[PDB]
Amino acid sequence: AIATYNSHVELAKYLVSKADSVYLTIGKSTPWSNETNPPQPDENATVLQEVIGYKKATKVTLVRPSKSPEDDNKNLISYGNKSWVEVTPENAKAEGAKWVYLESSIVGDELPLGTYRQVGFVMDLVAKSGISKFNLVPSEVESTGTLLFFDNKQFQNRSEQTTAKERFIVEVDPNS
Amino acid sequence: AIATYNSHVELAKYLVSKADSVYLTIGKSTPWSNETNPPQPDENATVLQEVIGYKKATKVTLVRPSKSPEDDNKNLISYGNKSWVEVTPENAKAEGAKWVYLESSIVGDELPLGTYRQVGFVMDLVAKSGISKFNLVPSEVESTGTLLFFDNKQFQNRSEQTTAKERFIVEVDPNS
Amino acid sequence: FYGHINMYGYVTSYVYNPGMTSSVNQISASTEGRGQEVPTDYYMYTSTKNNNTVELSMQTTSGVSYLYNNFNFRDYMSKYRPQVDLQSDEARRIVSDYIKELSIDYYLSAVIPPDESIEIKLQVYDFSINRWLTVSINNLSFYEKNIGSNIGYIKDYLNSELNMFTRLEINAGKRDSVDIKVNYLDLMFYYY
Amino acid sequence: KITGVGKETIGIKLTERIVTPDEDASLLDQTSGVPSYFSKGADRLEEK
């Protein structure tokens, strides 16, 4: 029997409640067989290939597509060719906010420089005893938590100047 | 973007952790327009129609469909013409168990007698007036919590002798 | 969304055509069994670029030789695109009009000399004039090439099951039996 | 990167990773249907 739309809202509130444990992760520092077209992803994965590291999320929030005029004085986001609005946890079921927005940014060399091709987000990440810094290479992680979401992208390079933003909009069931 | 199989597994471990707050509900004691052919269930709904009562979930567990030979010696359950096996929270990713089994039996007249058509399961249900008992009529529910899963069946009847065992097997994303 | 081929093909001396509908193995029996379906390793390893080259040995001079191959889009679009029609009587329209263009990666090397070489011709079944069209050629001394090519749109190639078949035509100068270090093959597209 | 000043103790770590076929599908039963059940015979350690 079917899950409901408000079940997907509550499950999104559950994910967004986990926010403090949420990290961006990046990997696949060597080429794909084809760099013009990354392979479509596999949901049975538990980690990225060739992991470069983890960065604590700067933005975990509920979202939905915006609607004018009533949303014109809410927090708008432009992503993936479309307009969206954030939603706060205590307003999720009043708004229908079953999507989650995830973002982080890597400021310069706070992970070792190079290229990356995979992007993912984990919840329940924990670092080794007494580490507090928000950037972690894999060997500084104690528990990788759970890999929730990820993608295969064309490469991006990183240098000291560049603040590498990476982001997703997602829903717990994208096909219903 | 997309969720992953193991995300659904961990979300099922979350709904199973809620189990004590879980109740069967039955309703729709008057006819549909066609009694052989009910209307399809609307996931925007928040409560059943014509509510007859609530009964605490006599069972909540992770399960999966059974597979041979490796389940031939295990804890089998029979449901809806299919054979299922119980799974435990700390093994859910090793077995691939993303399905939740939910069940409650209304013995005889422990809810008011007469026909019912709707069957649902609610979590976070809270009763009135310090009440201990696991069978509740609507006048003894304070907060209905959240209607997680439901179906619009044909009618059935209940008498003093007949137990009405109602149950589901469900996953957090049945279909992406 | 990407676009690839990921995990049937048949080594032979024989000359054969499918019909507009043919099922996968019809090659082997119609070719009098004068050939060999690829060893299982082809499906297992050469479906990604790696270093487990499923190397194979060949017979040709008075006979030519081929490797025939299958491209059953029904295996794939029913899996990765279950919200797209694959059964309507011109669904082949949606097949090419969703796939858009196509293009190829295929890497392999000889083991024949750093200074002597062999000939391989890529061919695709077109169901208009009914031919394994001569689409492209490369020539092969010791070192590898990505012998894959760009190819255009594909409606012309679409066999009725929502399927296609293509092949390699092999020639060896005068070398009556020879090895090839086949590495891997894939076919490329996008969606959103 | 050595400092190029004073002594520089250059030396290795052999780098432990436990290896299920469940991470490594190249190790899942290619004698039949690949994850075809035989495919969890063993896992590995690895230490490059």
Place this chain on the structure above:
Amino acid sequence: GDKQSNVVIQIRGMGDQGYPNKTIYAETVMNADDIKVSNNASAETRVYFDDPMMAEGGKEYAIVIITENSDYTMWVGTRTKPKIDKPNEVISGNPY
């Protein structure tokens, strides 16, 4: 490489590094004019010295293959590798 860079072959003895000693036993200058190239290690590039050198028995010498330039790319053999002429076939440890 080009016609004006070169390999110089020296011949030398051996030091207690196990590597060559530094001694000039023999010497000869070999530009790209002087060098022969092959896809299958067959272009027999002959290193003639000005007078000979007497290679005593029971002894390792070394060739020192002096150059400034990478682009002199010879043909070495190495442990269990596919041989360049016929790569189906693989080497000893040291070829020699």
